[PDB]
Amino acid sequence: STGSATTTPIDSLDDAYITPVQIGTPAQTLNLDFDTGSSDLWVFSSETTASEVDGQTIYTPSKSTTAKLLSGATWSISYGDGSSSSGDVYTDTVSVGGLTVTGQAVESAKKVSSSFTEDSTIDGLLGLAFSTLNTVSPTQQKTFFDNAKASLDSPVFTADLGYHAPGTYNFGFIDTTAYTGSITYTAVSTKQGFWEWTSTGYAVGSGTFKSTSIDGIADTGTTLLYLPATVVSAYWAQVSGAKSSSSVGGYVFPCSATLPSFTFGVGSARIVIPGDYIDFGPISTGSSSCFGGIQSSAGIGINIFGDVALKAAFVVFNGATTPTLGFASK
């Protein structure tokens, strides 16, 4: 089997991407944030504290004839931005782009933190990291991909995120028309439960490539590109007037600047992030100071190839017995 679904930026900055997901019988379609950095499929629901729902579409398990409460199971997750959610667990039928899993754990939120409430465009998350990170207790549950994988034509999914544009998540096949050149595959460590890999280095604009190992994670659920302080300093030094602002929480730059590209290495291959992908717009409405899309990972303890990087590539998440990651230009 295969599935294919369009993924859409939630806003004009590409802060996150939503993909429609059918849950239950009859289907309840929710727009979920596919997150290769976590491993829980959780949704706003009829059980979510009413004051914490503000415009999201909710899953109502009592209206799904295939929903079954998973006895005694709860979940609770925290994300790197300080946000969180928690609740109970149903199993139900879940379909993405024509690919159907029965018995998928659907984590129904009883509580969500303010950032989720305040974002009406995201109805929940669909985790695509390794199932070892799933938070359901006392019996950990499998991700949608893990449940689907044996049925897929090939045990893979691909992320083709758009810059200010629609994109695609495919399951079970590689669309060879969706990229240029070849896909370069690189080794993955699952030791932290992530799609963790080692980039071979970077370049800033038209500058010389610096060969250096940068271990980080391919994370569709993180907006920005978080890299070591030395690398990030080298990037922003090429932007006149850019500064690291303690009050804002990272590098900012004059909105009138033209940003250089940023290149990262995948083996001998190179993925070029155009400068405008690094512009996250005014720090507050009407400001002429803009937020940068490349930020230091020093405070977070891991490098993160988030959407800024991934949307410059066609990315293969290869879930073969030994997982690998593939990157192609597009």
Ligand X SMILES: Cc1nc(N)sc1Cc1ccc(C#N)cc1
Catalytic positions are: 35, 199
Q: Which is nearer to ligand X, 35 or 107 (CB)?
A: 35
What are 187-193's contacts with CB under 8 Å, separation 24+? Answer: 187/324, 188/318, 188/322, 188/323, 188/324, 188/325, 190/130, 190/132, 190/323, 192/217, 192/302, 193/39, 193/129, 193/130, 193/132, 193/133
Cα distances from 198 to residues 182, 213, 222, 289, 299, in angstroms, run 19, 6, 18, 33, 19
Q: Smallest distance from the beta carbon of 151 to ligand X, in angstroms?
A: 26
Q: Which is nearer to ligand X, 37 or 260 (CB)?
A: 37
Show the tokens assigned to 118: 């305040």
Q: Smallest distance from the beta carbon of 125 to ligand X, in angstroms?
A: 6
Q: Which is nearer to ligand X, 58 or 234 (CB)?
A: 58
The residue number whose beta carbon is nearest to ligand X equals 221
What is the C-alpha to C-alpha distance for residues 22 and 319, in angstroms, rounded to an integer?
23
Q: Which residues bind ligand X (CB under 6 A)?
A: 10, 15-16, 33, 35, 37-38, 79-81, 83, 119, 122, 219, 221-222
Q: Which is nearer to ligand X, 37 or 292 (CB)?
A: 37
Q: Where do the DSSP E strands lie in 10-134?
A: 17-23, 28-35, 41-43, 68-78, 84-96, 99-112, 124-127
Q: Smallest distance from the beta carbon of 264 to ligand X, in angstroms?
A: 18
Q: Smallest distance from the beta carbon of 234 to ligand X, in angstroms?
A: 25
